[PDB]
Design a protein around this motif. Sequence first.
Motif, PDB file in Angstrom:
ATOM      1  N   UNK A  72     -11.306   1.816   1.706  1.00 19.79           N
ATOM      2  CA  UNK A  72     -11.713   2.790   2.329  1.00 19.79           C
ATOM      3  C   UNK A  72     -10.990   4.307   2.815  1.00 19.79           C
ATOM      4  N   UNK A 103      -8.336  -3.976  13.985  1.00 14.18           N
ATOM      5  CA  UNK A 103      -7.547  -3.939  14.091  1.00 14.18           C
ATOM      6  C   UNK A 103      -6.783  -4.201  13.271  1.00 14.18           C
ATOM      7  N   UNK A 104      -5.654  -2.574  12.375  1.00  8.18           N
ATOM      8  CA  UNK A 104      -5.118  -2.807  11.110  1.00  8.18           C
ATOM      9  C   UNK A 104      -3.468  -2.769  11.616  1.00  8.18           C
ATOM     10  N   UNK A 105      -2.427  -2.785  11.175  1.00  4.31           N
ATOM     11  CA  UNK A 105      -1.115  -2.339  11.139  1.00  4.31           C
ATOM     12  C   UNK A 105      -0.669  -1.016  10.623  1.00  4.31           C
ATOM     13  N   UNK A 106       0.393  -1.036  10.551  1.00  4.03           N
ATOM     14  CA  UNK A 106       0.158   0.771   9.462  1.00  4.03           C
ATOM     15  C   UNK A 106       1.663   0.679   9.037  1.00  4.03           C
ATOM     16  N   UNK A 107       1.996  -0.391   7.960  1.00  2.00           N
ATOM     17  CA  UNK A 107       3.483  -0.351   7.431  1.00  2.00           C
ATOM     18  C   UNK A 107       4.120  -1.665   6.734  1.00  2.00           C
ATOM     19  N   UNK A 108       4.606  -1.510   5.550  1.00  2.00           N
ATOM     20  CA  UNK A 108       4.434  -2.638   4.892  1.00  2.00           C
ATOM     21  C   UNK A 108       6.206  -3.661   5.309  1.00  2.00           C
ATOM     22  N   UNK A 110      -2.892  -0.777  15.971  1.00  2.00           N
ATOM     23  CA  UNK A 110      -3.829   0.341  15.606  1.00  2.00           C
ATOM     24  C   UNK A 110      -5.487  -0.280  15.612  1.00  2.00           C
ATOM     25  N   UNK A 115     -14.414   1.686  11.933  1.00  2.00           N
ATOM     26  CA  UNK A 115     -14.886   1.868  10.055  1.00  2.00           C
ATOM     27  C   UNK A 115     -16.903   2.178   9.797  1.00  2.00           C
ATOM     28  N   UNK A 159       7.575   6.167  -4.336  1.00  2.00           N
ATOM     29  CA  UNK A 159       7.514   6.629  -3.377  1.00  2.00           C
ATOM     30  C   UNK A 159       9.061   6.134  -3.089  1.00  2.00           C
ATOM     31  N   UNK A 199      -7.369   2.909   3.618  1.00  2.00           N
ATOM     32  CA  UNK A 199      -6.966   1.736   4.218  1.00  2.00           C
ATOM     33  C   UNK A 199      -7.269   0.996   3.461  1.00  2.00           C
ATOM     34  N   UNK A 211      -5.892  -6.077   7.937  1.00  2.00           N
ATOM     35  CA  UNK A 211      -6.192  -5.220   7.464  1.00  2.00           C
ATOM     36  C   UNK A 211      -4.351  -4.579   7.725  1.00  2.00           C
ATOM     37  N   UNK A 212      -4.598  -3.581   6.409  1.00  2.00           N
ATOM     38  CA  UNK A 212      -3.797  -2.498   6.722  1.00  2.00           C
ATOM     39  C   UNK A 212      -3.753  -0.762   6.806  1.00  2.00           C
ATOM     40  N   UNK A 213      -2.931   0.395   6.966  1.00  2.00           N
ATOM     41  CA  UNK A 213      -3.363   1.915   6.664  1.00  2.00           C
ATOM     42  C   UNK A 213      -2.342   2.576   6.894  1.00  2.00           C
ATOM     43  N   UNK A 214      -2.229   3.660   5.519  1.00  2.00           N
ATOM     44  CA  UNK A 214      -1.137   4.418   5.741  1.00  2.00           C
ATOM     45  C   UNK A 214      -1.693   5.670   6.196  1.00  2.00           C
ATOM     46  N   UNK A 220       1.477  -1.279   0.435  1.00  2.00           N
ATOM     47  CA  UNK A 220       0.301  -0.003  -0.160  1.00  2.00           C
ATOM     48  C   UNK A 220       1.041   1.244   0.210  1.00  2.00           C
ATOM     49  N   UNK A 221       0.363   2.356  -0.862  1.00  2.00           N
ATOM     50  CA  UNK A 221       1.415   3.727  -0.675  1.00  2.00           C
ATOM     51  C   UNK A 221       0.004   4.514  -0.890  1.00  2.00           C
TER      52      UNK A 221
END
Lengths: 231, 231, 118, 132
Positions: free
Chosen positions: A141, D82-87, D72, D76, B114, A192, A202-205, A108-109
Amino acid sequence: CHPRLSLHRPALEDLLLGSEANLTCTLTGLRDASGATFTWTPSSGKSAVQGPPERDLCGCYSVSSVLPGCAQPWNHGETFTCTAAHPELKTPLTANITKSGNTFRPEVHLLPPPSEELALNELVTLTCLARGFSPKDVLVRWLQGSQELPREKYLTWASRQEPSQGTTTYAVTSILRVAAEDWKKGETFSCMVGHEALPLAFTQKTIDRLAGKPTHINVSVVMAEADGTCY
Amino acid sequence: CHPRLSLHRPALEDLLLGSEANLTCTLTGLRDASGATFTWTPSSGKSAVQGPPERDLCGCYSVSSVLPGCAQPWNHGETFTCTAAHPELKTPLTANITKSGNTFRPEVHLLPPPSEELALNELVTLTCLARGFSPKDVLVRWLQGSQELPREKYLTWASRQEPSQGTTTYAVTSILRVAAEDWKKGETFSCMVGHEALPLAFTQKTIDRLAGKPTHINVSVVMAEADGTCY
Amino acid sequence: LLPPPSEELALNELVTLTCLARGFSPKDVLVRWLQGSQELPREKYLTWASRQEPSQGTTTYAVTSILRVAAEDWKKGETFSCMVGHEALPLAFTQKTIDRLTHINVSVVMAEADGTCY
Amino acid sequence: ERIVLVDNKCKCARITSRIIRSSEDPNEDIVERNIRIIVPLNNRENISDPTSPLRTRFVYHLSDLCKKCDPTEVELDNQIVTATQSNICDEATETCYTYDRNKCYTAVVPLVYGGETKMVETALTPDACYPD
Ligand SMILES: *[C@@H]1O[C@H](CO)[C@@H](O[C@@H]2O[C@H](CO)[C@@H](O[C@@H]3O[C@H](CO)[C@@H](O)[C@H](O)[C@@H]3O)[C@H](O)[C@H]2NC(C)=O)[C@H](O)[C@H]1NC(C)=O
Ligand SMILES: *[C@@H]1O[C@H](CO)[C@@H](O)[C@H](O)[C@H]1NC(C)=O
Ligand SMILES: *[C@@H]1O[C@H](CO)[C@@H](O)[C@H](O)[C@H]1NC(C)=O
């Protein structure tokens, strides 16, 4: 015409956010759509519904069934074996469906707005790119601060496959337009992405104006003979 | 099935680059056999040649006819009416297509990769974006230096419309992944966009390194006997 | 007289030097090129003719000329020039501002100041 | 010097940033970024006693300092997910350059007591190692 049989996977929006993973089985190409047969291999809550025989290409009837269930036997690797033994043919046909193995997880970027949109002070664009995932299903989303925006405020494209570096992987994009003033005020935005191969699903930036490419850089290196504790 | 006749505008790749303006009045769904004839309202000096029918859904056919008028009176404001004739439901069908008004220009953005992708020594990714154009017809090509890359090296999506305030507009994206040694040596890349409302019909953008490079860097080496940091 | 483009000094084969003369009232003007202090034969460079420059109110004229010279000579530091000759000048004199040659600043500070951090 | 992005105490590196709404050209402005490194001149390479000589080379990767991998919470629809925040946090394992004021660092030394030996434990940072 010609009869065929199909079995489609459960949709990702109700498998990840909820857990009710209903299935579907569909036969098309009949004109006597009352005499039909559906049979799955597990049926404990065996009330598999049937619906109204809606039309098809050039007004041919089409029957279908739904077997309800939730997401623990799907994600653990069971099998489902819907079969049609209708009397409009004298021989039955079969199909099956299973959770796809050989998966990959996306990258994700989030990209900041371009430099030449900031001069006009009207509206700025934020792009979200998700790349390299092996199934063809994804969720996207957006959030502002910690508030989810409604779905009619952004545009999301479809998922397509990318030029082959050996194995087949996919990609998807999405954009969002916000006001130029509150991007400069200091609000934060997030993209997200949900996919069934990620470990926490899930993952978020999260991006904002202060966490970006700087114009000035100040570097100070201090040498500490005194101690090595870092107060 | 039911009989219907529609006709299509010429392709944009043949109208901007090539010289093959072809309108195609065609009807698919014919209870009878191949017995159809078509007449057009202009008589510019060419015979609307035809092709054989095709294979379609369960007994239906598909006849067609191409008007060879590749001299472009299309962008001057013609009107180009077609007219059907066949031993069928005995009322001859007609249809009308013309060039669109209320045109807008697209706005083209090309985004840098990126930094996370940059700090890994693999392929890096570029993004092209065009938005705000009024008809949903567009062409996207890529370049490296001056050589056009073949179109099996990049992925481009469809052209969908975006949520906005009344005046309907459309958007499109594309990506391209290059090698990190070509990026780090200093080779440049370009995204090129063709539309009908652009006065010279094409636009270019170019990107390389040193795009968002900083303008000032200060380095301070604070020696010993001066360590005066604060919490 | 203009510096060469950067991208022509990346293949290191040949470089181009462009001499532009602009804004003069009569339409007759010579352009001569010279290497160091010796001139060149006029079959080694290309010069255009003069045209009416677009301008508000009063009319001017412009002329252009170029020269392709070897890249390693410009990398060495040999000097090129341009001689624009005219009848409405004191002595029809030249201009020679091109050679091969960022802002760095080095400071030392005592900084026994009042009270600060780092 | 206004908003803190990174305050790392394994490497003792701190990154701040501030939008300087500059005076001239008052409809554009700069983004400044300050980095501060404090380098210890007497620490070892591994934090034990006889390891290897004093460290003389210090490397800082800003892609690792800005990293964020703790899960974190995100609301929604009407839900908490719960989600992660990095690749990149496929794995402590990082090497530290300085100590930290809020953590013990101990060692084990064998000494003799007439007969056998023992496994006497020794505090390397004495302020942070009281049992309390
Ligand atoms: C940096 O130095 C520390 C301290 O010496 C290293 O940790 C220590 O490594 C030793 C050897 O791997 C461990 O000793 C082992 O003890 C167990 C009994 O607990 C025994 O079964 C083994 O045979 C061995 O004797 C020791 O436990 C360990 N941890 C301490 C002292 O807390 C560390 O590995 C070094 N790291 C690097 C990157 O050099
Ligand atoms: C699932 O279907 C495939 C072919 O459609 C066939 O191998 C068999 O009928 C099913 N597989 C298993 C393992 O039962
Ligand atoms: C053009 O198309 C419109 C819409 O169907 C139709 O009403 C009109 O008669 C057509 N005009 C001609 C000249 O074909």
